Amino acid sequence: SFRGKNAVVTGGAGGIGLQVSKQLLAAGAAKVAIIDLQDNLEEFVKLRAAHPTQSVMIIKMDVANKKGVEATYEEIAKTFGNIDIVVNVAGIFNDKDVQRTLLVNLGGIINSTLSALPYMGKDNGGKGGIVVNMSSVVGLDPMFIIPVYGATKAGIINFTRCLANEKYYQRSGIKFVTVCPGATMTDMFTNFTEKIIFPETSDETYRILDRLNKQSAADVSRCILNVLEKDKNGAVYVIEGKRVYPLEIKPQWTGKEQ
Amino acid sequence: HHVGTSFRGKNAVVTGGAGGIGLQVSKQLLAAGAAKVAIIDLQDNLEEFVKLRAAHPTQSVMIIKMDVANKKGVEATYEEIAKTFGNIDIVVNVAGIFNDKDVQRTLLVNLGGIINSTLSALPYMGKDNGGKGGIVVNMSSVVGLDPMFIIPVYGATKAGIINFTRCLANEKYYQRSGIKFVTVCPGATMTDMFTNFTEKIIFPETSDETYRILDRLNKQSAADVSRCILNVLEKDKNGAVYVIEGKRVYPLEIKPQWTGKEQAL
Ligand SMILES: NC(=O)c1ccc[n+]([C@@H]2O[C@H](COP(=O)([O-])OP(=O)(O)OC[C@H]3O[C@@H](n4cnc5c(N)ncnc54)[C@H](O)[C@@H]3O)[C@@H](O)[C@H]2O)c1
Ligand SMILES: NC(=O)c1ccc[n+]([C@@H]2O[C@H](COP(=O)([O-])OP(=O)(O)OC[C@H]3O[C@@H](n4cnc5c(N)ncnc54)[C@H](O)[C@@H]3O)[C@@H](O)[C@H]2O)c1
Ligand SMILES: [Mg+2]
Numbered sequence: 207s208f209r210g211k212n213a214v215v216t217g218g219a220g221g222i223g224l225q226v227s228k229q230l231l232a233a234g235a236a237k238v239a240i241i242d243l244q245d246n247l248e249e250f251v252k253l254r255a256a257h258p259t260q261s262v263m264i265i266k267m268d269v270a271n272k273k274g275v276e277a278t279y280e281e282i283a284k285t286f287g288n289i290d291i292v293v294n295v296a297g298i299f300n301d302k303d304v305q306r307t308l309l310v311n312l313g314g315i316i317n318s319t320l321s322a323l324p325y326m327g328k329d330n331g332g333k334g335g336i337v338v339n340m341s342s343v344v345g346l347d348p349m350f351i352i353p354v355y356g357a358t359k360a361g362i363i364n365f366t367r368c369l370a371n372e373k374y375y376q377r378s379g380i381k382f383v384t385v386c387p388g389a390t391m392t393d394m395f396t397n398f399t400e401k402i403i404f405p406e407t408s409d410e411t412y413r414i415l416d417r418l419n420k421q422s423a424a425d426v427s428r429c430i431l432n433v434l435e436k437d438k439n440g441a442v443y444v445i446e447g448k449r450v451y452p453l454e455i456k457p458q459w460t461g462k463e464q
Numbered sequence: 465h466h467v468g469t470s471f472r473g474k475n476a477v478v479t480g481g482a483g484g485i486g487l488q489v490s491k492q493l494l495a496a497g498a499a500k501v502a503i504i505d506l507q508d509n510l511e512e513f514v515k516l517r518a519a520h521p522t523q524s525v526m527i528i529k530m531d532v533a534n535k536k537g538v539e540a541t542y543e544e545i546a547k548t549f550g551n552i553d554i555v556v557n558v559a560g561i562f563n564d565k566d567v568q569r570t571l572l573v574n575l576g577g578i579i580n581s582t583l584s585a586l587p588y589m590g591k592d593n594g595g596k597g598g599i600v601v602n603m604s605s606v607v608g609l610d611p612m613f614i615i616p617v618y619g620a621t622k623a624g625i626i627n628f629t630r631c632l633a634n635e636k637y638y639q640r641s642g643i644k645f646v647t648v649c650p651g652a653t654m655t656d657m658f659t660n661f662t663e664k665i666i667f668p669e670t671s672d673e674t675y676r677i678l679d680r681l682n683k684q685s686a687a688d689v690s691r692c693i694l695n696v697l698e699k700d701k702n703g704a705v706y707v708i709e710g711k712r713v714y715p716l717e718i719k720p721q722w723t724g725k726e727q728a729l
């Protein structure tokens with residue numbers, strides 16, 4: 207299934223990304239590299255032990271750091287020698303810090319995606335592969351409480367769909383997929399109300415926070431592995447209530463000129 | 465330079481107003497009778513504005529040199545504008561760059577600039593804070609609606625602007641502030657943004673595809689787009705998204721992307 211495959215996962219020390227890393231290994235992935243800010247060291251020790259015939263590599267790196275990411279990917283390629291799968295999950299919610307939100311959520315995805323390509327492409331010696339970028343349902347349909355976060359999520363979609371063009375695919379053999387999950391119980395929502403732009407919308411946060419138990423990080427991760435098996439270039443998937451929904455995206459309809 | 469009455473007695477701010485589209489927006493606002501016009505740009509273009517001031521001697525034309533990426537700078541700039549003008553009715557956020565080789569700059573300017581400007585203006589416009597309400601128009605692009613594979617980073621920022629702006633137009637906010645939020649999405653337009661275009665794309669092997677954009681530059685001008693923008697302002701419809709192509713304005717009827725009709729797979 208994913209046996210013999212080499213994978214990289216940003217945000218792979220926690221939440222959804224952690225479950226992606228775990229499940230990839232449990233699905234028989236040869237090698238798994240984790241790029242994250244947080245150490246979670248005790249957790250990775252036991253993970254190595256549970257997969258003694260599989261490589262588990264952790265690099266502490268901020269995905270916002272372009273050169274850092276570039277360097278990190280270099281280190282991975284020395285060890286791995288090839289990359290088949292990239293899952294870019296890293297992201298934060300903090301609408302009070304615009305610059306950080308933009309650079310992490312949108313720049314991180316881009317930095318990681320672009321840094322991986324030379325080690326994956328059929329041109330430059332690779333065998334091709336797949337990149338899955340973490341967007342959100344709110345990137346598809348704006349959610350008024352969280353405009354800055356949402357903007358970064360919409361950007362990820364546009365970015366990822368672009369790279370899936372036939373022009374690139376024929377040359378690189380790399381596929382590009384976006385996933386858009388709904389509310390999911392993770393540390394991203396810790397102190398959520400403290401981090402929203404408009405304090406007078408604190409009484410509307412229930413709209414998100416009451417739905418967190420409707421799917422888990424593990425559930426979302428299972429849907430992601432499902433998305434990987436489909437291996438369909440340019441696809442966009444919604445992940446809601448533990449299920450995967452393929453989107454057929456149609457261009458916007460235009461009214462008569464005013 | 466006949467002065468009309470369309471925007472008579474109104475105070476306006478325009479980011480990116482020293483050149484291209486934004487310049488024409490500034491010019492046309494003044495020609496449409498705007499009381500006061502503040503320009504936020506990296507460049508001052510005094511020679512153009514000295515003459516413009518002279519042609520509009522009863523109208524204020526203020527230029528402040530500021531990078532829209534700079535949060536505090538923009539905040540400070542807005543304070544200065546509010547002290548001078550005394551109130552803000554209209555904001556047109558046009559500032560933006562194309563340079564996909566500089567990801568961080570693209571993100572912070574094109575997306576962060578829109579956000580910084582939009583958020584910095586709200587306290588001076590809102591009814592809940594002594595303002596009279598007003599309108600913000602944010603500059604996206606058609607590529608923000610339908611991705612254009614040559615320019616993924618630029619396009620990402622354009623898509624973001626749409627999502628950001630549509631959020632702020634929620635009835636929840638409007639009732640309190642009386643501020644409206646509108647997005648415009650123009651097609652290709654002959655401007656300095658396309659100078660040295662092909663050297664600024666990410667993937668050099670797509671240089672033979674740039675014609676797809678560069679051959680459409682002649683279908684509408686910076687002045688044409690600006691006229692459509694003033695047209696959008698007159699419509700004054702909260703939450704609206706407009707496409708600007710071949711010198712014409714097209715209102716989009718946006719339907720949600722995620723619906724229950726999809727089957728699980
Ligand atoms: N939880 C949800 O409701 C939900 C829904 C849809 C999409 N998402 C996406 O999932 C991602 C968040 O994952 P989560 O929900 O498990 O949250 P989480 O906080 O549990 O996990 C995020 C992980 O990313 C890492 N990270 C954060 N910033 C980083 C940076 N600059 N560099 C490197 N690593 C960094 C963190 O260490 C953390 O382990 C975000 O991209 C978010 O857009 C979340
Ligand atoms: N011309 C087109 O094809 C087209 C189509 C759709 C949207 N747009 C939008 O038009 C905007 C401006 O481009 P243009 O076509 O008018 O050409 P332009 O480059 O002449 O105009 C941009 C203006 O914004 C200013 N500016 C740039 N970066 C800035 C910053 N960080 N801070 C302050 N000011 C800054 C520049 O000095 C310039 O005066 C872009 O945001 C772009 O998204 C252009
Ligand atoms: Mg978590």
Ligand SMILES: [Mg+2]
Binds near residue numbers: 560561562656657
């Ligand atoms: Mg420009």
